[PDB]
Scaffold this active site. Sequence first.
Site, PDB file in Angstrom:
ATOM      1  CB  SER A   1      -0.870  -0.054   1.069  1.00  0.00           C
ATOM      2  OG  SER A   1      -0.046  -0.232   2.586  1.00  0.00           O
TER       3      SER A   1
ATOM      4  CD  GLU B   1       9.342   4.246   4.928  1.00  0.00           C
ATOM      5  OE1 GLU B   1       8.536   3.267   4.253  1.00  0.00           O
ATOM      6  OE2 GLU B   1       8.915   5.096   5.700  1.00  0.00           O
TER       7      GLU B   1
ATOM      8  NE  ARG C   1      -3.743   5.251   2.336  1.00  0.00           N
ATOM      9  CZ  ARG C   1      -2.821   4.560   3.238  1.00  0.00           C
ATOM     10  NH1 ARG C   1      -2.722   4.603   4.399  1.00  0.00           N
ATOM     11  NH2 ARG C   1      -2.040   3.555   2.224  1.00  0.00           N
TER      12      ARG C   1
ATOM     13  CB  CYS D   1      11.040   3.552   8.594  1.00  0.00           C
ATOM     14  SG  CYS D   1      10.337   2.130   7.407  1.00  0.00           S
TER      15      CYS D   1
ATOM     16  CE1 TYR E   1      20.085   1.329  22.519  1.00  0.00           C
ATOM     17  CE2 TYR E   1      19.426   0.796  20.265  1.00  0.00           C
ATOM     18  CZ  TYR E   1      20.125   0.494  21.470  1.00  0.00           C
ATOM     19  OH  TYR E   1      21.019  -0.667  21.831  1.00  0.00           O
TER      20      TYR E   1
ATOM     21  CD1 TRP F   1      22.638  -1.868  18.028  1.00  0.00           C
ATOM     22  CD2 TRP F   1      22.412  -2.039  15.618  1.00  0.00           C
ATOM     23  NE1 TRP F   1      22.748  -3.143  17.497  1.00  0.00           N
ATOM     24  CE2 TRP F   1      22.596  -3.229  15.969  1.00  0.00           C
ATOM     25  CE3 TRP F   1      22.200  -1.863  14.353  1.00  0.00           C
ATOM     26  CZ2 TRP F   1      22.743  -4.502  15.143  1.00  0.00           C
ATOM     27  CZ3 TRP F   1      22.328  -2.951  13.290  1.00  0.00           C
ATOM     28  CH2 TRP F   1      22.489  -4.311  13.970  1.00  0.00           C
TER      29      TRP F   1
END
Lengths: 134, 134, 128, 134
Positions: free
Chosen positions: C28, C56, C82, C91, C125, C127
């Site tokens: 979608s 993405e 939309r 993402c 955050y 990584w």
Amino acid sequence: EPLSAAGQNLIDTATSVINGIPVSDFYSVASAAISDDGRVFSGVNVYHFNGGPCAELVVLGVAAAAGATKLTHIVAIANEGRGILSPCGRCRQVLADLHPGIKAIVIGKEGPKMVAVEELLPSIYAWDKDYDRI
Amino acid sequence: EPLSAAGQNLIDTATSVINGIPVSDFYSVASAAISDDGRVFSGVNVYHFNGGPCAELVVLGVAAAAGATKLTHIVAIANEGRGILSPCGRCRQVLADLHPGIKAIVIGKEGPKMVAVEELLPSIYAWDKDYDRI
Amino acid sequence: EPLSAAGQNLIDTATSVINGIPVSDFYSVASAAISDDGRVFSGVNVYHFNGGPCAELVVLGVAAAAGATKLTHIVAIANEGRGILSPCGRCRQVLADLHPGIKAIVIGKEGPKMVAVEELLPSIYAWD
Amino acid sequence: APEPLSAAGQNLIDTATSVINGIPVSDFYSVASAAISDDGRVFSGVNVYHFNGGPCAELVVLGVAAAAGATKLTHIVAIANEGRGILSPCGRCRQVLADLHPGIKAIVIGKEGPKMVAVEELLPSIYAWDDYDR
Ligand SMILES: [Cl-]
Ligand SMILES: [Zn+2]
Ligand SMILES: [Zn+2]
Ligand SMILES: [Zn+2]
Ligand SMILES: [Zn+2]
């Protein structure tokens, strides 16, 4: 919003949980959340390249299994005394979609703060949970 | 391998768990696993389009939080009184990589059977867990 | 940052993609990103309960396949007119971790704006 | 029974091989995939390694194919970097493939050369994703 006594208790619970197990690269973070009835739920992450859950998501499963429908506050604590970890983006999205208004505990300028998850996703994507689509 | 007494207890435990909470599109499956020292851990799934964990992955986080490093058997049970679900492919991978030789309980010809997760992934992909790489 | 000519070109590309394919139970959204070589990569999401990728993330895999080391802008366009969708939280995390400083195109007051992904994850955050 | 590798199968191996060989060796982008549609077009991609469940190469390919308007994929392979060759689909990939592209054949290693196996055969006692309301 400044850290409350209840928030400090969540930090203490999650710290106790992660420090209670051997140091592991796979199970390296604990989380604790409190419900609106005051029950506390905790868990540790499961690291895996297919998207094993963060500790926060394990906590959501534990709370659901207990029938605690409303969670109000949540924190993640790193192993080896490393302290508070902010929720990652995935955790923010799942928390905003399934527990709107839950406050995540994070590091702040004067002390830890308690931030509604929606404020952690500015210009938010709001999933319409009624449908299996984005 | 036919269902054992401990296997029936995992079914009974997961069934009790899922049927103890309100019916939900999002928290719809429970899982229970047993450790080598006889400890039973349970949880429910968290459905979300970003890869919310299956019940089995919530159980792995619960078990890890308890320091239960070796899990020997696991089952998933559907809601609304409805019975064994075989592990999905992601659960099979995570289980194979993190709990080698764990047996999943699945429907069988003469009754439920208990199958090593590796036999549920023929021509297996084995993650070298030492590295953050596929 | 106001929408740039490059960002508009990206919106055109992503809109063309999602409007050019049929309805499906499993997708979608299209996404397109810009590389620092002027390359553009596109893709559609893969909806699945085990964490099928957003549009993405598919785009990141297409960029990687092309050896495209730095991506500078990205956008997600939904079906059924939309329009622009902000990146979801997952993402945002992947983008911040793998493409620091990439700007996501989102809807703000004066139309589309471009926002560094880190600004979309306050108290981030990272990584390690 | 598994089918022997076809010319189209070999072309997918060759496509994925050229792709993965043409990029810098990376732990984050370590596997390429290629799939062929019924309309004869070949689509490729590389994985995105991330702890929130970044997609395998196969899942990227599904998104590439969908963006191209290719609704029916018949064969798929994954080729690892550094001459590591064919990787079987991981458990997550098998589940997504079975649910979204039923009957797609995955190319896996065989004693007498690679074989092409319907993805359902790679998930014995399969879990099927079932909801008309959503
Ligand atoms: Cl995932
Ligand atoms: Zn997280
Ligand atoms: Zn599963
Ligand atoms: Zn997304
Ligand atoms: Zn895979």
